[PDB]
Design a protein around this ligand. Sequence first.
Ligand code: FMN
Ligand code: SF4
Ligand code: SF4
Ligand code: SF4
Ligand code: FES
Ligand code: FES
Ligand code: K
Lengths: 263, 431, 44, 213
Amino acid sequence: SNLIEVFVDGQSVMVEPGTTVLQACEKVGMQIPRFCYHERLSVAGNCRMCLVEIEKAPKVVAACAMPVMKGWNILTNSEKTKKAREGVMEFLLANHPLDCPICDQGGECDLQDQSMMFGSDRSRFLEGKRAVEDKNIGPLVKTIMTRCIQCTRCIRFASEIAGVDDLGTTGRGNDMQVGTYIEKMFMSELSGNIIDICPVGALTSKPYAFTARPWETRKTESIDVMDAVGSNIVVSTRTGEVMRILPRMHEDINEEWISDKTR
Amino acid sequence: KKTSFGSLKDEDRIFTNLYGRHDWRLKGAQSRGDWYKTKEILLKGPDWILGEVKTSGLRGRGGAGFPTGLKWSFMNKPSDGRPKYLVVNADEGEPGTCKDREIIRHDPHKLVEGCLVGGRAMGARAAYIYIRGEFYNEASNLQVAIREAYEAGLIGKNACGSGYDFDVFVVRGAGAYICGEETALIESIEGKQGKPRLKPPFPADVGVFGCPTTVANVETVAVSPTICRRGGAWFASFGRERNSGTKLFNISGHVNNPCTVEEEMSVPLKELIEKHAGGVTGGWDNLLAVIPGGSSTPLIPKSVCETVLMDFDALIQAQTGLGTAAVIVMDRSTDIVKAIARLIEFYKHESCGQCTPCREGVDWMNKVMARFVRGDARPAEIDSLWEISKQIEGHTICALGDGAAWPVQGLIRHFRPELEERMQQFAQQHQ
Amino acid sequence: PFDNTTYKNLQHHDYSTYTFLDLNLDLSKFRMPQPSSGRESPRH
Amino acid sequence: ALFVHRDTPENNPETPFDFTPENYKRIEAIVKNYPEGHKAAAVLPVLDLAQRQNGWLPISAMNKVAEILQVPPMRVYEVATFYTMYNRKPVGKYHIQVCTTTPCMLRNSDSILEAIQKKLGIKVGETTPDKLFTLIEVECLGACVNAPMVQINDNYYEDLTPKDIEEIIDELKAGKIPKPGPRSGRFSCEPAGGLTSLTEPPKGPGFGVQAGL
Ligand SMILES: Cc1cc2nc3c(=O)[nH]c(=O)nc-3n(C[C@H](O)[C@H](O)[C@H](O)COP(=O)(O)O)c2cc1C
Ligand code: SF4
Ligand code: SF4
Ligand code: SF4
Ligand code: FES
Ligand code: FES
Ligand SMILES: [K+]
């Protein structure tokens, strides 16, 4: 009744009002790149990887945050769009550390993969990089914060999902740092989930550290028995051994989270 | 029509205590024509006031230059149950800009009256004046001026006797240029890091405390009572069409007599410097470049400065902008690359860090510009720096990112031979 | 007598550390009652 | 210049801080400036008040503000480390702040920096052994037409020369209060050597008012 017509690369699609440009693209099976946007977290709009051209609009818009307008044509693959992604990826990687061989994210990293699909294939950055001190937040999550890309997913998850207002940003500018400021442990029953939603190897599982690589694991979709919720899980194994536990999306049970005992 | 502009007369100057030579407290302000027939203005209704502002042609004096009557009329709508507010932007952080400082401390009652008149136009119940924390003495002048108005019945309950309740709160900043950005200012009032918001929603829908808000510059609001008294047509008789009224100018840098002065819009840049600032240091022929509208605007070389006018449309054609109208003058003794490198260093220290192209890009531009100052680079890097600035521009959340790119582009656009020469000197020295 | 030769903004030479907040405290008796969002805070 | 806190003997959650009764009344007025349900808006002014009473912000002071306003301590830490006017290390009795952005740089603010460093025997970012003066560079202070200028505590001192700044430091060491403002001929921002505008008597009430009011 109140659905409005929008176009994704000229293909009409009917969407409810309030739907964002990113959600409109999803309806035609196009996944806009993203780093800060998580569909279960509050909208942030700070990574700028989702910038997309609207036909006849001279300014690219943040797809994750911009509501669609009737008759808008979203050019998900225009040169204007592709150049925006390349520029943002170049900034994201300017100070990122050359850590892939020693970084646990390697092989299942959104920064690696989107650099492959949407970024340039080389660097023109001729300066020294930023280096950040790591911060101890407990025995479950290891922090290598020089890898952080300041997406604030962890802050929003801790505040909104876990109900713990302990994570934040200190300083400002290029020196802005995610952390707790003081020496504090993020020991919530849902804390381990921030490993999953951190797109990079800034936050990783301490127990899992260094033991495997994503491509060599076998995924057994199973159920958790650590409580009576029955959270859907993926049991990662390799060469006959259990390597780790991951959440499995179930909207009506655990969504995409598991408890730390489950994990 | 009028073809030449400038030579404004004291009879037609809005800010008559610009230099603090007269009493700044209520008694002086009244004798100079402030608070006169404020009740009549308020009882003529918002639609009349917005029409006066609409017809005056007033454009935002904070930097963006958006037409004011149109912008203020977004608040002209029925209330949905939330309070409505007018936030006054007294952050005054743009390097080269100090015009708002003189209004606040020497003509505070014009601002306080402007708050009430503009607040009535929008239907707001109060005004928060966000003044940078480094202006402690000016902020104390304003609170003194606000106390007098409360004690005279000019604000508060039944303000001026119009049956309209209006409060004027002063809230101080704590050191951040980014809190001059409209939405970053709002987050600062709410007690957060001064990080801008994405738009939509626009502040007129969801602003301070989540309520309909209009952010207006101090100068934009301070002239509003006078436009209502003397009429929009009187204000529109000044400056080129679409570039109406009288503007405050700050001439700083390499002039003989740096000063703040009120001059008609569309005055020539050359006349403005010679007439009021005493001319460029070492003679007009000793001029190298001018930053015409604050650090965020690209510079222009002497050749353009010869004939350019000072208004929004004239300076856009010279590939720059009027900005805050802060004129920074550089004579031929200036190390131009060093001067622009220092501004990029400023944006580096002021970036809120929220969004990727500015958090990483501006710091990258700063590191490159530092090497350009010494010539420790290669000519191919100049085109790389131009491309990098274009990746920041138009891709960031707020316009600080654009404001960091534009100075770099201006330097490359007009002084590329200077950049290459410096690299030639560095290369041949280490050769 | 009209005198355009003397600076008349010399009060701030005598302002101190609490002048701004003392004035804010003084103004508190003039303000309209604040509006309410209906809860103590967003965390309630 | 670090944005992490490490507890030390003179800066830990047990460091004694608390507002005086006089400041608790000022805090009440600050909170009344904002709608009920949005008390977090008072974080900046109340944090600044704690620094005015104490001179700087120990972590205990940040926690005290958080407790008073019922705001998570991290949200107070975020504000304290974002805004540059908050001192998270003890500073000197006189915090000299020299503007070095381009408009002040063009008027030889470097000489002002030299004069302060030569006279005080310290470098930018340091404090004197007597803990009287702390010196830092800052960005534009909104007084560019009066460059070169510096801010000491709440006061601006403008149109400076190496001599003028050296005198101000003498006045501060001796315990005197140097009057703020330009140290040249002029009083504020008017052109030197005579006004070029605003020389006529100001017009009185009702001048040029449009018909119909
Ligand atoms: C980084 C940045 C700093 C700004 N600083 C100020 C400022 O100090 N004062 C001001 O009036 N506007 C400033 N602005 C512009 C405001 O965002 C906004 O456009 C303006 O306050 C609106 O008021 P106006 O329409 O009356 O001009 C700044 C913008 C940016 C991007
Ligand atoms: S986070 Fe991704 S891109 Fe960065 S080092 Fe680890 S695997 Fe490589
Ligand atoms: S630690 Fe990870 S999730 Fe948190 S802001 Fe950095 S990149 Fe984002
Ligand atoms: S452009 Fe810079 S100042 Fe503006 S929101 Fe982005 S990071 Fe912050
Ligand atoms: S995904 Fe939209 S800006 Fe990050
Ligand atoms: S550049 Fe120094 S006060 Fe503005
Ligand atoms: K991760």
